[PDB]
Design a protein around this nucleic acid. Sequence first.
DNA 1: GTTGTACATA
DNA 2: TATGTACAAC
Lengths: 608, 96, 292, 10, 355, 445
Amino acid sequence: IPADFVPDSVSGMFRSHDFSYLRLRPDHASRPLWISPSDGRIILESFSPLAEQAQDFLVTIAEPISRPSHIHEYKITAYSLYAAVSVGLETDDIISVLDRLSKVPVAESIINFIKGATISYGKVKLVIKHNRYFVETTQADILQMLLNDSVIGVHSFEIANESVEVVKKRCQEIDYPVLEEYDFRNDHRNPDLDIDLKPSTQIRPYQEKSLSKMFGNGRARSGIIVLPCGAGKTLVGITAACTIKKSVIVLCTSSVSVMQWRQQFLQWCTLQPENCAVFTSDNKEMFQTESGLVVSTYSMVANTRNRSHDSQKVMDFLTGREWGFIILDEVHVVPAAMFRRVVSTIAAHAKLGLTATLVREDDKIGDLNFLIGPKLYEANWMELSQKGHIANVQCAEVWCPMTAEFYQEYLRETARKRMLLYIMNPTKFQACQFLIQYHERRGDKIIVFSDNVYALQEYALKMGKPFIYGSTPQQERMNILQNFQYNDQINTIFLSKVGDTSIDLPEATCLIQISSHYGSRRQEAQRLGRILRAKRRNDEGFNAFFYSLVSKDTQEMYYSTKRQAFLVDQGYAFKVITHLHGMENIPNLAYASPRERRELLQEVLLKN
Amino acid sequence: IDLLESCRMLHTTCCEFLKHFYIHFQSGEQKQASTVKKLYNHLKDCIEKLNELFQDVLNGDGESMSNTCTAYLKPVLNSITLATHKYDEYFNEYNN
Amino acid sequence: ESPSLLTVIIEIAPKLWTTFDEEGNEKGSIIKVLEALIVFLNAHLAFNSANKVAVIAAYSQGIKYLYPESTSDLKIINSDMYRRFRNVDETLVEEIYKLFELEKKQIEQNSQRSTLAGAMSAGLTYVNRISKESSLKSRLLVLTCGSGSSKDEIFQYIPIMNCIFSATKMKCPIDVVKIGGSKESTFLQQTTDATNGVYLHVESTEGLIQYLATAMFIDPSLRPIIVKPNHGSVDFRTSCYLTGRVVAVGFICSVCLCVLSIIPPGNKCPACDSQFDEHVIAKLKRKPVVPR
Amino acid sequence: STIGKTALGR
Amino acid sequence: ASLVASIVEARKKRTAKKNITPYQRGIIRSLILTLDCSEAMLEKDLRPNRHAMIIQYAIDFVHEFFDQNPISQMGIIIMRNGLAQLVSQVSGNPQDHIDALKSIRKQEPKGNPSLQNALEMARGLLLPVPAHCTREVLIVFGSLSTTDPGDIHQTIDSLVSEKIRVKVLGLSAQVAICKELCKATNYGDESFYKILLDETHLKELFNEAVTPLPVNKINKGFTLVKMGFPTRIFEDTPTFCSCHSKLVYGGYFCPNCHSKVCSLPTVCPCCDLMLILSTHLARSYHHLMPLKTFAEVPTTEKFRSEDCFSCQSRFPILTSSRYRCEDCKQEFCVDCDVFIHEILHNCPGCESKPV
Amino acid sequence: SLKHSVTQYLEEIPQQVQNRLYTSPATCLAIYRILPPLAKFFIMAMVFNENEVPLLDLDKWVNSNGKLQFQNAIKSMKSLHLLIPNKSSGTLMINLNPTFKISLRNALTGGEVQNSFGVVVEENVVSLDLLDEYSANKWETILHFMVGTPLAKIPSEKVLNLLKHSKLMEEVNSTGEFKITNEGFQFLLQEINSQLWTLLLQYLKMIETMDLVDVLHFIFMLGALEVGKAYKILSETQRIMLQDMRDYGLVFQKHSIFYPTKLALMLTSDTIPDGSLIVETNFKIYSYSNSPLQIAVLSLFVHLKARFVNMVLGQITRESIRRALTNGITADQIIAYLETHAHPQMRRLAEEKLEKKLELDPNCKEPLQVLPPTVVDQIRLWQLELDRVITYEGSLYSDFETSQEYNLLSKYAQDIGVLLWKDDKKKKFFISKEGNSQVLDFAKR
DNA sequence: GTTGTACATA
DNA sequence: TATGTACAAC
Ligand SMILES: Nc1ncnc2c1ncn2[C@@H]1O[C@H](COP(=O)(O)OP(=O)(O)O)[C@@H](O)[C@H]1O
Ligand code: BEF
Ligand SMILES: [Mg+2]
Ligand SMILES: [Zn+2]
Ligand SMILES: [Zn+2]
Ligand SMILES: [Zn+2]
Ligand SMILES: [Zn+2]
Ligand SMILES: [Zn+2]
């Protein structure tokens, strides 16, 4: 309150949030940014000049909250600021740009917060030599700051391989955030790999921007690249591996996804098959060439207790060599209790993380800062949707009213048994069948998700359609996916939590949900990703669909409004469908008579 | 519709001769006289056709449409007779 | 629907109205016109409360803005009337008193050219100022007395014809009321016809309010729906440059665009001193060709 | 936008 | 200094407008509008695209061109697929040209441009033009290359022989042939090749071309043109028009053959005599007697009145907010000065001053 | 609705009163400005001539294109009885009211007026410092009190009774409080000119024995007076009227002299947008308004989060919408506020969205919508949540000796519209409490 | 086919 | 901490 600041009669409605004490600049009509002097929130006008010039600067320094059609909303925090400085940015540049783009003068509170979050970047650097990690520094003065540190223990000192996760986290608190850069141009000890992108490739604009933020200064930066599902993160990793020209290892959270890496990898670049090896439960042979590629999964690299005699040799092969590049697909699972060990065991000069969603329920999301690096680039979902790179989706949330017969038992039963009770309500069966028939007549490929295995099998058998879940062998699920892609007879397939992410189905154009995890917002975004890469995503008037069948007046509605809190932030709008037109005229519907409904109630309650 | 189309047909052709006659009449070259004479004869025939059309309408529509028919083609007929009158007056001054 | 600005341009001069009084049997008819104008302006202020009034007088030695008064109180009118009407009427009469006294001082001064073109040009400038300042329509009214035999109206052609185009760009109809012997003014009549205006000629000063309230009271907001009471028909023709007779078909110089009913003497233009080629002019001189 | 329609059942 | 910076910028702008000499300008013109519709026009430098913006400004240019030059003629050509396509013949009807431009707005531009083909077509359309009209071509070039079947130099020489004049409005940068085409055709002047730097400059460039081009001293084509002033008639019954052969309630009557016409100004379809109204000629008087520029009055001397002479606006009380006319010596406000030299074309003080 | 509302009331007043209302030229000058432009043109033509003009002559003036406007102009003029039509010798002669004719002539020609416009004391006061502040504070108090936002100085009993008597600001003694009504929201959305006329019309309707003619002679005369000048004091009834109007912020009179204010002149005629807001699919609000009123009205159905000098940002939530519906605000009005106060960007995008759907088919698949459909659906869906359970007060009828009796009583209730539910099998039916007495009386007979 | 272990959520 | 589900190995 740097003035008399007579409060307005309505100032009471704003509890300590009234920011009218500051005045507006004469050039307000041009400057697009409003800055909250207390909470750090930033409001951006996407319909005014200099909006594009700020849509990228704000992303670098601030993590988005919500980016709807017109008015964007960012927020400045310590985590976001750490990312900007790590790539290389001084407080002067941020202050100059923020002041130049702010309708109102930047308050001292925000200036202090940004100034306080300043680091002496580049003083400490972690290097790898013959599988030995040395914390080298460019000046001797740092030794008095590190060697005398309580936790620890042109100058460097040794550190244990496993203890890297301690020093890096400690380095975050002693004001020296270490940087993991790689001089692959000047690195001759590691055997180089000669792979380049073939001429047929065409790197999209956003892909180049994502790579520029990593190789901007010429040294491979270790960080995370965030792009919408289906944006081409696989090609981003391929390009990063192709330009680095060194042995690379890839970790993906499935066996199907591991295979699709190899197929796409052999396609987009010139890496011959002789130099590629896949390490999964089926086959474990390793490349004998001097420098090659290994594509595997966390489950095959993170296991510690018992390893098979055939797989123990592979782990030694992975650990023994000093790899030059590691790509972590779906990096939202690396900060788990055990998966993070893949960052300390497998030595790698540069670590890249690729994920569409960078959120999770617990607070371990920030652990990525000291594990693989900061967030380099993030792309708006709507920006790529309007440019034709990813298909548009008309999301919907169908309200299926639970019948009285089933609802009467929904109250008495316990919580652990309620889930199975409101997932198999007869009305949901009718809705799912009607939608599938309508879209099949529309010449669409449909995907149905269900976190509950019992519901998945029951739905599959009733409709006589294939299903995939945990117990399905790799060969069977791969065959099912290929058939669903190329076979005309197989129009739709039922998936489960296994295919919730990292499966490429370019022919998919419609998605339906009958079950879902408790409250995970990440799963909803990942499921929607299956259809964002539709082949016919550019023909006029095309609109993919995403249905969420829920039970009216049930605990599922509580989660449904909470399970779509991330998509709403990106700009997707969820509408409520209370009725399906032309649904009664369908000849036959499941559980249409009371006799069948009562039989289902007795059948499901038996398991309960 | 049939009568209206014929009137436009007659009007279009009558103006074409009027345009040609004036072009060859104001040229100022003596050699054009021969062509002017041919055009002048065509204009005289056009007057007869217009009069014949009125008579055809007069005895066909019983004067109900002849008054409107003459009005629709009154300016063109007036222009044609004026052109011939100017030719006759200058012809009298020059030849006679 | 919307407010409309009224700008009256009255042409008052000793030489004009004195001849009008002498020709007729009405003495002091200028008083009758002034009272009618005062009532007319009050009527305009009654059509709406958001419309302004402007009066520009063209006197023998220039122009003067009677209303609004320049930033730089005898009781001509009774004070019982409306405040807004009085605030305008009282100022108008006071400026009239000042101007005529000034004119009487310079009675012996020699004034040969009228100042109607300048007043109309000034009125258009005022219309632009109001439109740009502060969504307001405009209307020009020229209340001139044509009884006095004018010396030469040729010099009024180029200026007046320039006001027509400007008036057509701002959607500002200009109405003209003429009080005099001559029935038609070929320059004023063209101005009204080409600007969606109304031209009216009246011989008797008495009963002028009826003409003003019934003919020139049409606001710009309802022009498209009211048929103008104009009776005269204009030809949009101009007089020759060296003969002074209206020309239907003639010759015009391609350099200065000066109309010429006949070939100028000396085979040279009389307005720009441009020499015409003998061969080309001889082409025009050729006579019609008829067979021998 | 169908909000005033009957129940989705059948 | 911010306010002073604007005033000196205005003074600099007024500097170019101080030298207003009564140059001889050709009021009767014959213009050929050559627009570029090629692959190079698909760029997004001008929102939404070059093709859309150029057509939109072309329509506005057509409206302004005929409003200020009522007795002139215009034609439109487009460069498509390396060939010149004619979309409008030389005519005085502003509606025909606008209609053609609107149709062009739909077709996508493609192919390479060809200045020679467009110029050769222009040479033909302007061939049947009287000697008293100024033959001009206004090319809107957007490409940086030209593919032609013959020697462009020969065509440039031919254009000079026919006394044709060319104005070229480029988009990206200078092109050597265009500079030579404009220079060798405008008697050595190099001010007829304009490259826009933004959308706002583009609007000014089209608006500048509306004014007539001053003629050269050694190019003499003086003559007398036979014109006619018809009288409008009001007929109760519809009559056939002599130009379109349709039923129109009204129309003008020619004074040479009594044949009627629908709209003016147009050449009579019978006697080939130009028909115009006195207003059409009055529109161009300001191009022959331009109003002398007003000079800022220094604050050192004393002023006459505190308010404007024409609009009665209180002069804002450093710099004198007054503009005076030397002919009559009457102060004017800054607002009036703009309106007196752009919309109006007569100084109110001069007219008010008796002589 | 401004000229329609005032005109409509004048059509209800008996003609015998309209003739007396035209005696004061001050009223006629104001009544002259409310008529359509054509009516004023014809009236000005008839005022100065003391003769009768046939209706055919007036018809000749109007062009064929403007023929429709002529029907409305004559209808409005004749309804007010300003135009007296008389037919003589088969000619529908048209004349002007002599009282209205004389009043206009005196006003324009400045004749005797009997101080209809009042007098001037020549003691002017500063308007920006006092008149603007006085009315602005007085008008703010009533507006804020209406919006429900806390404010110390509550309006006097005069206007307070007017509000309660009218549909504005419904109050209940048993509840002990006041809240906005369905019409109250519409009143708040009306411009200052309409926001003032509605109150005056209610006051004029509530007036019981000041004199009706005196009230209008003052209201219309107030518009004649110019702001920022003194006016000496008038009728006995008008004296209390002047004091009463002092509570509405229209006139300032300290402790012999009263001064009109901006609102007094605003009564006669009129005088990016302030209030335009952007609504996203995230249920957020960003309003481009800087005023205590526009912010206060938004709080009725919005959860404000922070304020800036140039804009205010909020969020639509279930609690806020429920808070608005509990006060009686219908969802149809909320969408109207969001639709009538939409930002140009929303309209431009909607037009572009519609444009992408216009050329495709003639149906276009949709009409233009400024704001996303999902916001409308959620707001309407929440309203349904309030009406989830419907309860009626009444009685249940059972234990009928004969079926005919059950049908007779049940059918009678249906005829008078007091039947809510019935069952033939159980011979039971339920009727509303309102119709209980009628059904019981019918049962005995 | 089964047993010992993660990850993701109440 | 309990409970689903998916995964690797024997
Ligand atoms: N530059 C590109 N050219 C062609 N296809 C591409 C390109 N980038 C991505 N794709 C396609 O996009 C789809 C999804 O790619 P993927 O890398 O699996 O996406 P993500 O991992 O981001 O979900 C695949 O069909 C892939 O071939
Ligand atoms: F982001 Be993707 F769907 F792997
Ligand atoms: Mg992927
Ligand atoms: Zn000349
Ligand atoms: Zn025609
Ligand atoms: Zn002719
Ligand atoms: Zn001025
Ligand atoms: Zn001058």
